[PDB]
Structure 1
Amino acid sequence: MGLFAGKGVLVTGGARGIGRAIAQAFAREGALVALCDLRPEGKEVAEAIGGAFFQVDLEDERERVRFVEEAAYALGRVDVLVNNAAIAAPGSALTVRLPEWRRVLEVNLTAPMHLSALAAREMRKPGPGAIVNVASYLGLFAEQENAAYNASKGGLVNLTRSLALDLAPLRIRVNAVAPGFIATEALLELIALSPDPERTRRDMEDLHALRRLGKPEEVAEAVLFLASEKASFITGAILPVDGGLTASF
């Protein structure tokens, strides 16, 4: 069978985009996948891959406790957690409202911390565990009018290193991916509703050495690698999956 045959894999934000691609890639490799999402259409992603769906608002700490408990019971084991779910609140420090800023911090930074602790408790039971955080090139650099996302992804990058150090004694590896521009529905919607879609997309493509957008499946492959025993000496690493975005200007 496959790389994750009979392993329990938790994927946050699995209803679409990179999270859906991650849930599919794990299920292709024989994993029992529990995905959560705020969007109820995540039910169909779980049905199609033979996994479990949990409708969960990751802003709420009680719902995060419930998700890991119920996922663990449904799968019978937890081997991998992927912290994929994330939101943004448009605006500079000047423009963003404090409640919106705090919600971005809660979902993007506090939830991955909390879920990593909850999942880590389930990961001691069988053999070794792995966590992969989906960061962004915007955890390592800033862009205009995106303070909450930049700050939270920055925190997630150093939280990845913190978890790597603190969970090594439990035989858990913790790594992150930093995607470049990935052609998820979220990004294609933003492009589509731009004044000049073709020009916007061309300009985004041109920021990458590969001169194209990434596919969600390409981020999934990097997550699968970092979650697998092929990455047995990799922990605390931030892997750019950005087509060379962060290698030049």
Structure 2
Amino acid sequence: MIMNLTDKTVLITGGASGIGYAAVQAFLGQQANVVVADIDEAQGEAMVRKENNDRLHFVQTDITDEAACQHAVESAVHTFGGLDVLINNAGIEIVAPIHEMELSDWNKVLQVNLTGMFLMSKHALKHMLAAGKGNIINTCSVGGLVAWPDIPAYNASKGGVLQLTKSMAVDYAKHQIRVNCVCPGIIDTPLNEKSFLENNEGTLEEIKKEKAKVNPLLRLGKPEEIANVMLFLASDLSSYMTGSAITADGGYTAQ
């Protein structure tokens, strides 16, 4: 009744898995039209078949390429007639210390996490300015607020996301375009589980237990728990919020 997301068009980058996919489900569940922009064509089409929903559309998109970003925005406008909410959720992680990291690896992290956010936002904003309203939601991280160990390029990129979020909030408030971010803690997603095994010793379950011990709530976050923050930020419930960060980390940054 109060979410009021019915007939709103929501473009979600990295929507084919993890937090992005949980966001797809949550928004479809609120009667929003959802457009997923993701680089993984196979996983994207699989998603379309599983969800089997009129309100869902997939468009293959590499956000590091500007033409593809524009095309993703145009796909939303063609398919559902507009674009109310952009969720810049795609991101990658590469583990490497600064003193050993390859420039090409640094750039791969920054290009997806930050440059792609810029490019998607650029073209979404062109449309939202013309339409007279809009909403942008960025997937930041605890890593944008404090440093996760051993992932400096990631942390840096998310620091960029935090300030880009605030910048766009301040520059576009006069045009009624709200811009906020969510800062997730450690979320239990398949992709993350791969990172757990690569960078810690022990079985998957043992590593999960260790990670779920670093949070005051004593558990890892679920993708849907971040998706729910995105619902709030997209809805009119958060109408006086712009340029802000919502932390969802089980108490991690509180200590």
TM-score, normalised via structure 1 length:
0.94
Name the amino acid aligned to 2:77: A
Q: Which deviates more from structure 2 when the two are superposed, residues 171-180 or residues 122-131? A: 122-131
Equivalent position of 1:175 in the other structure:
180
Q: Which amino acid aligns with 2:213?
A: D
Question: Do 1:180 and 1:214's aligned partners in 2 also have CA atoms closer than 8 Å?
Answer: yes
Q: Which of 207, 210, 213 pairs up with 1:203?
A: 210
Does 2:189 align with 1:184? Answer: yes
| AA at the equivalent of 1:181 | I
**Residue equivalent to 1:240:** 247
The answer to which of 105-114 and 235-244 deviates more is: 105-114
- Point out the more displaced range, 111-120 or 124-133: 124-133
Return the alpha-carbon distance in structure 2 between the equivalents of residues 211 and 11 of structure 1.
Answer: 30
Which residue of 149, 156, 165 maps to 1:160? 165
Q: Deviations over 1:197-231 (max 9, x none)?
A: 33321221111111001110000000110111100
Question: Cα distance 1:189–1:108, how it changes in 2: closer, same or farther (>3 A)?
Answer: same
Task: Quote the Cα distance in structure 1 between the aligned partners of 2:77 and 2:97.
Answer: 39
Supply the distance in 1 between the matched residues of 2:48 and 2:58 (Cα, whole angstroms): 5
Q: Residue type matched to 1:242 in 2?
A: D
**Count, aligned residues:** 248
1:65-113 superposed Cα distances (whole Å, 9 cap, x missing partner):
1111122211211000000000122212112111221121111111112
Equivalent pair of 1:89/1:96 in contact (CA under 8 Å): no
| Alignment of 1:217 onto 2:189 | no
Identify unmatched segments of 5+ residues in structure 2.
Answer: none
AA partner of residue 208 (structure 1): N
Q: 1:173 to 1:71 in 2, by over 3 A?
A: same
2:83 aligns to what? 78
Task: Answer whether contact 1:88 1:146 (CA < 8 A) is retained.
Answer: yes
Distance across 2 between alignment mates of 1:192 and 1:111? 28
- Secondary structure, in 3 states, of the residue corresponding to 2:19? helix
In 1, the alpha carbon distance for the partners of 2:161 and 2:148 equals: 17
Query: Which deviates more from structure 2 when the two are superposed, residues 214-223 or residues 91-100?
Result: 91-100
Aligned to 2:24: 23
Q: Which of 40, 46, 52 is the equivalent residue of 1:44? A: 46
Report the more deviating stretch, 212-221 or 95-104. 95-104
User: Aligned-pair RMSD on alpha carbons?
Assistant: 1.6
Q: Given residue 206 of structure 1, which amino acid in structure 2 is its aligned partner?
A: K
| Rounded Cα–Cα distance in structure 1 between residues aligned with 2:122 and 2:65 | 15
Deviations 1:16-38 (A, max 9, x none): 10000111111111111010111
Aligned-residue sequence identity (percent) comes to: 40
CA distance in structure 1 between the aligned counterparts of 2:164 and 2:25, rounded to whole angstroms? 26
- Structure 1 unmatched runs, 5+: none
2:115 corresponding residue in structure 1 = 110
Q: Distance in 2 between matches of 1:150 and 1:115?
A: 20
- The alpha-carbon deviation at position 125 of structure 1 amounts to 5.0
**C-alpha distance in 2, partners of 1:166/1:127?**
14
Q: Which runs of 4+ in 1 moved over 4 A?
A: none
SS for the counterpart of 2:212 is: helix
